Amino acid sequence: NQSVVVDFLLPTGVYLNFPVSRNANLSTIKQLLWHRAQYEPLFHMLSGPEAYVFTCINQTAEQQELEDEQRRLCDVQPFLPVLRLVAREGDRVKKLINSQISLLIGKGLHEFDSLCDPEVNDFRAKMCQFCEEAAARRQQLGWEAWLQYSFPLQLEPSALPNRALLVNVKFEGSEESFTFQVSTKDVPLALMACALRKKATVFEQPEDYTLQVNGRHEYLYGSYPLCQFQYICSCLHSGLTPHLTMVHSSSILAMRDSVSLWSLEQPFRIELIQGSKVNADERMKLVVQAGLFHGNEMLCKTVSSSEVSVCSEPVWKQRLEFDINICDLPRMARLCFALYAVIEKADCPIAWANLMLFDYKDQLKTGERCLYMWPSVPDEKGELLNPTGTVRSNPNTDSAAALLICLPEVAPHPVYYPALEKILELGRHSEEEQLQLREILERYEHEKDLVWKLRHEVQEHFPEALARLLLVTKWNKHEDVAQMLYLLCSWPELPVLSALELLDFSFPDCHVGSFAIKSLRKLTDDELFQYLLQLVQVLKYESYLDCELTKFLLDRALANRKIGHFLFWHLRSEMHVPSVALRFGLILEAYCRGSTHHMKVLMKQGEALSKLKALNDFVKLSSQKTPKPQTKELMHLCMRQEAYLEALSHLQSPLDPSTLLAEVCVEQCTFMDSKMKPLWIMYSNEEAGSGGSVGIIFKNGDDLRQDMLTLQMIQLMDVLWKQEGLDLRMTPYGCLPTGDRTGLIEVVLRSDTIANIQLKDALLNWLKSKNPGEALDRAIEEFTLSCAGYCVATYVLGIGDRHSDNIMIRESGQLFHIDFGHFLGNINRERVPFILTYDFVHVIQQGKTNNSEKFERFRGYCERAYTILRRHGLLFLHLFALMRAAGLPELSCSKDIQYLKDSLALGKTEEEALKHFRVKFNEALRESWKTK
Template identity: 50%
Template sequence: MPPAMTNLMDLWAAHSQLSGEDLVTVDFLLPTGIYIQMDVPREATIQHIKLLLWKQAQSYPLFPSLGEMEGHMFECVNQAAVHEELEDETRRLCDVRPFWPMLKLVTRNCGRAERLLDSKIGVLIGKGLHELDALQDQEVKDFRSKMFRISEEKMQRVQLMTWSEWLQACFSPQLEPGGGATPVTDGVNDKQAEASLKVTMHFDQSQYIKACLQAKECPHLTLVQVSTVQAMFEKEISAIGAVVNRKSSNPPLPLPPKRRGPSIQVRAGLFHGTELLCKPAVSSESSGRSEHVWNRTLEFDITVSDLPRMARLCFAVYAVMDKVKKQKSTKNSGKVHYPVAWVNTMVFDYKGQLKTGDIILHSWSSFPDELEEMLNPIGTIQTNPYTENTTALHIHLPDYNPHTILVRGRESQCGKKFHIELKEIMERDPLSQLCENEKDLIWTLRYDCMENFPQSLPKLLLSVKWSKHEDMAQLQALLQIWPKLSPRDALELLDFNYPDQYVREYAVGCLRDMSDEELSQYLLQLVQVLRYEPYYDCALTRFLLNRAQCNRNIGHFLFWHLRSEMHMPAVAVQFSLILEAYCRGSIPHIEVLKKQVEALSKLKSVNELIKLGTIKNARSKTKEAMLTKEAMMTCLRQSGYTETLSDLHSPLNPSVLVEKCRYMDSKMKPLWIVYNNKLLGGDTLGIIFKNGDDLRQDMLTLQILRLMDLLWKEANLDLRYALEKAIEEFTLSCAGYCVATYVLGIGDRHSDNIMVRSTGQLFHIDFGHILGNFKSKFGIKRERVPFILTHDFIHVIQQGKTGNTEKFGSFRNYCEQAYLILRRNGNLFITLFALMLTAGLPELTSVKDIQYLKDSLALGKTDDEALKQFRQKFDEALRESWTTKVNWMAHNVVKDNRS
């Protein structure tokens, strides 16, 4: 059942808070077969409710057979429609929030301490551990077993620490600016790191296979495709017609007769990253209705020995229809293909064994744009967990009896002559495509690349023939002597284009040099690229867990980055495994995180209460405000709310505590929460809590803005702080935001989204439109300027003096310096955006979206050419500033009409 299902308990809770009720009617199911219904306080703990039930049950039959009260616990059906054991009886009923007010009393098993910890972790990560226990997946079991052992050893070491050692381990300070504590390895010792890399391939032990190997031949990979079942094709084809009709001006496509059904085909492709290893294999057409059977063998033009370790098998199921013929013309005759479903699987399992036998793959129906031949190699390798209404693909992989073959590479005989052409290729940005001749040149001069352009490793990897095991072996030998890259350069190697296990291990090795502060800067991308890891136990997962468990601040943000995406089926199991491993190795952190999870649940309930009150009193604005505020205050005064929201560490910044709360009068009724930074003795800090908005695009934009500020400061150009005069503060911060909003293409820049602090610092909020996705009204662009630079801003910059050209000239010079600094780091920005491509952000779905950055930074041009382009944009912003005023006036008129 999808996690977005409406929670009936929440709706009842909101209603009871509006009506002033404090009790909820709960059905209790006893193991004796007795059913009891009684009213209990919704603020009561599970322990207290069990005591009330026990007193009530004494008057019912079979009570003596229940035994001791401590020998029982409650179960409920949670919001995800699965059973949850309520082992932690200090929780309140309102915190448990069962899907339906029904509790089942069950006999408690032994091992209560372990079960209590499991229960807490399950509640914390939003997925009961019994669900992981029930998975019939050996990879999951092996990963959990390994992480359990590592976590247990870590907690034993923690128990032997002194207080000062524990504080140093969990809250390691930065020793100096730009430095940090000594990096910690993730369990790979120096001897292991120096060991020679070996590639194992698995072949049939038969004499035929051995003869083929001796003759430098190998059988081609074959795939026996059995059938697709339960495909729901009639519904899918109807949906296809509707989608096509919406996306084009052509009339709706005629659907094939129901009695015959559409023709269905399956396409299969072998990929290494986004590289197609050989020509895709295509099945014959099948004209069944709900079940399609082929029983045909699909053969790929690649030998088994040439399969790279991270090869993935990608399938696309599609309908084949006759193209619509226009009147008086037969030019459009033929067939068209409409995608129905896709699914991917790895060729090798997590142990490195070639997969064999029968496999059932439950597919996905949402297709991203710009797919090559409808295959989606960048998509998840997890099968769809919602199996009832999905297309199921049954395949059979031939049985190659395991026989390990060691593939050894040979040294390259190429010379070390430096080529000017090679230098030009290596200086291109990451989005630039390489032609085949350029790839051959790079591979031939790979030792020159290592000596003169070590940061060009990504381009070398794109030049490897991944369908040749000789090239793969030589690359793996080369990686052992390749100079270590800077962490920023190594980030690109974690992109989907570089799936090789040894490449990613090399990249993680480079990341170990990151300080904790720098790791926090890039944590958002590092969590997203976990999606690219085909196996649960990998170098990146171990690295993140180790650094998170050694520094609670990193652990805090790792937890929330993972927790915020637990509702996505494609990553739910992977992220829950990592979260469980983190919690088991950071048991003292569990209670802090648990309080934050409960607090967010409370704030969500308050927001839903406000929305419900708004709907019920929509006719009277005054009455609405009065009743809604009264209901909110009544809710917040409840003991469960006051206790949970008191002394609360903010999930955005764990160093500040909550102080007060009110709600804002806008569509989503966001809560305005004020925090008091008691730990650092700072001023109060206000944040907005929005319930129902996807703010990950805002997170990405804010992260990039922080990075820009860091890069400017590294170049001794501070465009935000350290200045005493408010006008100078405004001038410098305005310069920073002019450049940043232009480079990132930030839209929807009206007066409500631009703020000024009392110190004079200007800053922007709300980043729902980026990369040049500017708003339009009736087909007319509302924003015509590259960035906001109104005459009011200029008036402040010139200190109120119209002829103060010196101040304005300084401002313009700041902007140009800032722009050139960002250009020098253009590859880093492209890499960070590329690593977010699979995050599902609305305006970052393909490489074409990142092209905006390449254009705004004028990558590929000289500094003089780029500066000329920026100056033209600057003049355009000045010249067209009147359009900004008109846009702001229109926005204010619309806002006033809404209110």
């Protein structure tokens, strides 16, 4: 139905109930309300319409004062159609932001209050102050700094030939433009000057200008040459004339506007009182295994309770003493429970739960604690406990199972884990063996003790072996913990590569993570971006809410808008996961508060995303009943509705916020009538140029994280190759998870799949029909370079699942791989061989039988490509290690990482590795003929 009856609560106590249109804006509803109110009592005591604001209860259960009255009631989306008039006055800016945050981050901000938690409340106090302040300091800086913040430089890696080519520059609010020639090695200041000279023909300074690539939020500035910019690099390669606009600084300003722990030598213990809401088999009996942990390793032996009979509310009431003293517990000591169901005496993991012993203020937890457990999932490892599992409580306190335990009072005063000054106190005072150390470090219980004895030598001569020396340390003895922490203070700064290793769950200590972040501060924004996905997943390993890694990510998010955008979506797309909903919720709130400009961008994207979900659901409801042409017509009729059209129109692309999705081309929109039924949405932009058309695929039903991870890794290789002067013409198109099994994929235009193009020498003739005459030599070189790149990439990453309909080719000649579903050999797995395909090998050789000259160049590209990845092999191992946090089925253990060790052959030397690669190559060249 079109209309809807809305309840209206007037400030006099009077009540009105009349129908309004779902499409009416709130400004129109006030007018109608006032018109109706005049015929109800107490009207003469109301002030004017403009004196009041509507209030509603939004979908997240909070009062929201509806300041923007150009919004439709269907866009406001109140819980029940109920609006209350209230006084405008107050702190309207704080109230507006808090509501917008709740709606954007998914969770209502009241739910953080509802918890009654010091750690949450302290986190929200400290970070929101930090982010608000950083945003305030950002405003007081100049337009240049703001331009660097908002539109950071997009450069080509290495951040040679000096040919000349034309370039179009103009000024804002002017149809006419001045075309002129410049060189590739010119700085951007020199380009502006010629435009300002061309301006001064009949008739300012260059330093009060920047160049905007028109149709985009992408600006050319700084002390880099014109060639190093991605636009001019993409223009000079393609041949298109680079269009630019001269923006004034004022126009950029327009956009901008005493008890000791070690004295207590008593053994550790807990009272195990009760279970709760336990759903097990009544014939069986319940047992609770408990174990202390510091990372993956145990601090002492794992104790157990007695066998009580299975019921909803089992009652144990037992002391469970452990083989460790209260003084010996390290800062990150982690008590870990698992409730098991066992058969009648003379195993079913029911649930599990973990608890940090010390709290966030460093105090040892005392008294009763109710751990709402997480349900155990059967896995291949078959472990007893889940020490790597999350430390937060299960949010489903309504129906989830619980274990009631009580950590007893260790002393009358509250005892804390000692401060750094007293840690360094204990740590301060305390040719032959060097040969064995070299051999062990530069390559077990014997070896670990040698690493411990010569730890000063490890610090002195083997600084990069810090991770090894950490894992050999005995964290269940406080003397040993002090000594290792003492060395850590004076430990020399490690490179980014070594720091990444230290962010893994194996190193839970706060000082280690702090050291790790201390070494990641040298990251430039470009390189941070390559690891952002990995860093966000590591947040799931953190014990406490406030951590050095969280501060780091927010700092970089607030200093670079592009980084914050992707930080936001990475976090936002996991808010459906109870494990991280709270943690991620709190980081997103802090971000928003220091990023009110980008909130308006993110708000627009969210409502674009919300309409597409609805639009895809309608297409799913329609495609089962009706055929495609009618459903395609019915998709457009929905899209052309004001609510839809305005929401989908005029937004920054989530996949790239510099791309401007302006006018949706409804005629060119469509969907694929198989599988999850992904929407194909096309946009236009007359200000842009030849690449004025852009596309997005909205898919809802698959989890896009593994497709993003794989795409991200191919992008990394492409950067790593480019840095050594090798461009293999890859297409690492964008892929962004935005929600629960929901995301956007960047459309690569002017491309079909090999399967569709093949419907004798079909690919060679297709490339002829897209590159006739002298263009064909480009297309084959684009094919050969790219084919080599994706041959190596898919080999190294262990990518199965390849076939004619998930490899695509571009009209330029470039071959590229899409829709990555499986990797690292993978559910059982086998080694994927290196795979040459006859049809590709046919195109590479220009359609001949034997073309040894060309084929050797292709052989060389593969060898060189593969050799370069080997030089950065540890980067891939470390990055993949941290992705185990993501809980991907195919990336969840040490053997999944071992696949990359073997495929890159890190255990072999550089000569020996390339000899094996040749054998795999040739065998692939032979196997391409055989089998039919």
